[PDB]
Each structure stands twice: as structure tokens, then as C-alpha cells.
Amino acid sequence: TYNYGEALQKSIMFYEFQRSGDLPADKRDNWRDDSGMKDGSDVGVDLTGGWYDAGDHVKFNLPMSYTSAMLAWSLYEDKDAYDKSGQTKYIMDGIKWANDYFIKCNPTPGVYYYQVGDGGKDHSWWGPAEVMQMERPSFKVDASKPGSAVCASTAASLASAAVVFKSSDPTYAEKCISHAKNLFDMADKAKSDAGYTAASGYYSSSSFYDDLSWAAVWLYLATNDSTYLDKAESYVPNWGKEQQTDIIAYKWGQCWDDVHYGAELLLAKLTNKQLYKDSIEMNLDFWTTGVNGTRVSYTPKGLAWLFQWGSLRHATTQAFLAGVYAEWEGCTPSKVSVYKDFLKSQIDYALGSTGRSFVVGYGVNPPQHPHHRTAHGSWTDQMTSPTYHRHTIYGALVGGPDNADGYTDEINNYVNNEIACDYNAGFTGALAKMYKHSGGDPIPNFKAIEKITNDEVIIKAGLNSTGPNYTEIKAVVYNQTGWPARVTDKISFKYFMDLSEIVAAGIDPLSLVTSSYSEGKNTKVSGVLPWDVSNNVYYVNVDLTGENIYPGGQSACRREVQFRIAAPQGTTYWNPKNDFSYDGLPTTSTVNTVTNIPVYDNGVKVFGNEP
Ligand SMILES: [Ca+2]
Ligand SMILES: [Ca+2]
Ligand SMILES: [Mg+2]
Ligand SMILES: [Mg+2]
Ligand SMILES: [Mg+2]
């Protein structure tokens, strides 16, 4: 079968790789670092934190809060699975990461920042989060420009977090409730998504009455104030219906844009009213046995296939709901096994039932090219380079196959290969249920400390110009950092020479003339300096300190410096052949990687050798 515990452990871990902001010292990876550190600076509010949505760096609060609410729902339903697998700390840290950010997004009563980053600008650059150079604007809703869905989705996240944190951190639970109440009030009074516009084209909302009910249900569970339960039920007639019927919609599934499925499931458990039981069973039946002659499509290999986008996201989310409902005493007895069989079949399809895993870094032949900027780690603003991902973003569930099980693992294949917060949300809960039922031990003390697979800072050089009394070098430093990607503003390199022939000529080695084209306004080439005069070794120091060299573009990641060292005009004793840094030097202005012109990062040699 499959190791569900390991799968669960990695799915939770996926979110740690999505983190924006000031990362914890207790971090268990060596390729993510501080990023989005000025988030909210444009409005004077600290909005750092939260999770990047998918393979991009925009913080879209609707999917983000849907995600944390779903993870909290799983912890609420299956704490015993989390405790037994030893993953409780990790999922709670994830839930708190998202919710600490939503709290920051509600700086004052009635104001809610729902996004940080501009989709257009963010998506136009392909590089690691740590070195983003573009503006990252903050967007907000308030009484005048409402966002009922995003406010209520966030209230649901906060309230569900309060439910699962109440026992261990009652104060934080109260903090979450305070903000949840404010955002729900905003949403409920407004009943409009008219001011929620910055996510247009990415996460535009098509409904908010579902979010209102979902939020109200969670606020009821968090506060035990039945005022919220009444509100939750009051919005039901306003939920979307199946076309030309008065029947609550049942042909889609729980997802960031439609949470009435989870709301009605919860309402059935909380009230035992037939309306809700019938509604959730209609949805679950449509997804399994079919209902009234209608049924979700199934691929030949057994994937319940809803839509071309995020098919696995949908199937595994429905698997979670089927698992939760199947365990409830109110579930029609004959359907319990049907629903539990569906949970297993859909999860197993994601884990490996077709012969390969659709979970990054897990199982057999997992996806190698998810559409994800930071895991790929390009240093040249190119989706195509490197031709492999520098990092393994463990746990990420890819979009999924087409309706015939077709799947292409390529970085530019969004339909099959995008990865996102919401894709792993329901999946995580379904995995907890499978772990509870079939086991599979998580990897003990699992960390994502990767080996550095490419020299992070290198230098290429070649002979630019030459003569009987001089040598001119063309050198290019490249920032190829990835563990973590980072700005290298304290780089320098040294070019070593043996000037024994200068001393022999009766000339002061320090009198030779050095000179320098060069990319980078701060490029400074020194005069000849002593290094090991007992062996007649001198050098030229080239300092690039101050240069904003970063792994985010062809020009951004490199600095070219051309420099020359010259003996007096008319002389012929200059001998570059006994110079340490000249040995092997490429004979033209077409540079190549050299190991004898060492590169230093803040005075520490990081590439190459010294004499
Ligand atoms: Ca909605
Ligand atoms: Ca020499
Ligand atoms: Mg820090
Ligand atoms: Mg490949
Ligand atoms: Mg020598």
C-alpha cells in the first residue's frame, strides 16, 4: 500500500516552503530565507508573513485562508492522527503562520488587507522569493469597498484556528476569535465582494453566502454563541442552486471559491437536520455512486475528475469530506463503506495507484518539474534554466491529469503541474484519515537540508587584451546562489601574479599600472598589492562590495570587470606565465570558469584557490 504518515508529514511540510516573511530560526530547510520583508510598507502596516499562493509570490488571502481553515478542520477532526504521527507541532505551526498574518491584515477594526503583491508584476519575473525586486502593493477592503468572501473566509480560518488552539494556547485562541469576529462582521454587514478586486483574474470570487455560512459555523464552534449558528443557517437559501431546481448545488466540490460543501457537512453534524444531510450526501453521492442519473466523470484509472484545473486538488478535497462524513453517526449506514472506499481510492491515486506519485518528493517517480519559482531556483529569470529544479518542494500535490489520465511533468504545464496552497489543503486532511486507518510511519526527524548542487558564486575569465608589457583580464562574477538564493553585495576577487621579473628589473612591483570596462558602478580595481613577497607574489584586488548582485536575471546575477596590469612601455620582461592566476586562463575575451582567481564573500574565500 502507501505510507500515509510520510505523505501527511510532507504535505504539512509543503507549506513551510511557501512561507513569506521573517522565517524561524527553528526552520528545517536551508533553501528558504527571509522574503517579502517590506510587505505592507506602502501602507505603513507590518503585513509580513503568510504563505505565497502557488508557484508565485503573491499573497492571495482568499485561497490562503481557505487553506488554513481546511488544515484546522483536519486537526479538529483528527487530532489523534496528528499526535500519533508526531506531526501535531508542524501542522499547528502552519496554521499559526497563516493566522498570525491574517491578524496583521486586520490592523484596526473594520479594515482588512486581503492581498500583498500584484499578479501582473509578480508573475512577470521568474526567480526566488528572497530576491524579489518589484513593488509589492497592499490592497484592502473596508465598509466602503467590501470583500465579504475574503473577510468571511479569513474569519473561518481564524475561528477554526481558535478551536484547535484553545486547549494549548487559550490566549491565542481568544486573539483569533477577536479578529474573526471583526472580519465576519465586515462580511455580514456588507454582503458584497464589490471591493475585492486586486485578485481579478486569479481569485475573483463567484460567491460569498457560502463563506458567510462557513465562517458562521466556525465562529459558533469557537465561541459557542448560537447567534452564529442561526446566521449560518440563514444564508442557506442564498447558496447557489443546481440550475432550474431549488436544490442546493451538489455537482462541484469544496474549494477556495465554494465552501458550502464544508459548511453543510458541518451543519449536518451540528444540527442533524435532514436538509444538510441530504445536501452533503447528494454531493458525495454525485462523486461516488452517482445520483439521479448524474455522476462526476471518472478517468479510466479511477480518478474522480471534476475539471481540467487542479483535478487532484478536487478529488482529494472531496476524499477528505467523504472521510469526515463517513465517520459521523448520521451518515446513511449503507454509504459509509462507499465513502470510505472513495477516500482511499482518490488518495491512493494521488500517492501512486497509477504507478507513479503525484506528490513532489514522495513515492515512486514523483513530479520533478512543478511550476514553482523558488523550488526551481533560476538565477537568470528563465523558466528553462536550470533544466532541473534546484530544490525539492516536498509534499506538493500537482494539479493532476486530464480526464484520460494524461499527465506531462513540465515546468510550463500549469494544468497538470501547478502546485498551490489550496491544492494541499483538503489533501492533508484526507491523508490524516488514511494514516489513522492504515498507518505508514513518517520519516523520523525529517528535514529538508539539501546538499549544495552548484557552486553558489563563481567567476569566469579570459584574456581580454595583451602585450609585451601587460596583461588585460576580462572577468565575470556570477551569483548562482540557491541555499538560500541571496543578494551578494560583499563579493570581491583577487588576481595573483609573480612579479619576480619586475624586482629583477630594478622596478618596484607596487609601481606597475593597473587600470579598468566593467558592469556595476561600484567596481573598484586596486593597484598592485603585496600578498607573499617572499615568493614575489602580488595581487590586484577587485571589489564589488555594494553591487546589488542577485540571482534574478542575466544581468542581475553577474558583474563583468576588465582590468589590466602593465609594466613600463617599451619593456619586455613582463612574464604572465609564472603568474598563478594566468595559468590556464582562456586565451580570448570569451570567458570560461576559472579556479585560480579566487572569489571572496565578505572576505571569506568561497570559490577558487589561492597561491
Ligand atoms: Ca465563495
Ligand atoms: Ca610574472
Ligand atoms: Mg529572523
Ligand atoms: Mg526532467
Ligand atoms: Mg612564483
UniProtKB/Swiss-Prot annotation:
Keyword Hydrolase annotated: yes
Functional pathway: Glycan metabolism; cellulose degradation
GO biological process terms, semicolon-separated: cellulose catabolic process
Segments forming domain CBM3: 452-611
Annotated catalytic residues: D56 (nucleophile), H371, D409, E418
Catalytic activity: Endohydrolysis of (1->4)-beta-D-glucosidic linkages in cellulose, lichenin and cereal beta-D-glucans
Keyword terms of this UniProt record: Carbohydrate metabolism, Cellulose degradation, Glycosidase, Hydrolase, Polysaccharide degradation, Signal
Enzyme class: hydrolase
EC number: 3.2.1.4
GO molecular function annotations of the record: cellulase activity; cellulose binding
Disulphide-bridged cysteine pairs: none
Family the UniProt entry places it in: Belongs to the glycosyl hydrolase 9 (cellulase E) family.
Known role: The biological conversion of cellulose to glucose generally requires three types of hydrolytic enzymes: (1) Endoglucanases which cut internal beta-1,4-glucosidic bonds; (2) Exocellobiohydrolases that cut the disaccharide cellobiose from the non-reducing end of the cellulose polymer chain; (3) Beta-1,4-glucosidases which hydrolyze the cellobiose and other short cello-oligosaccharides to glucose.
UniProt protein name: Endoglucanase G
Organism (species): Ruminiclostridium cellulolyticum (strain ATCC 35319 / DSM 5812 / JCM 6584 / H10)
Name of the encoding gene: celCCG
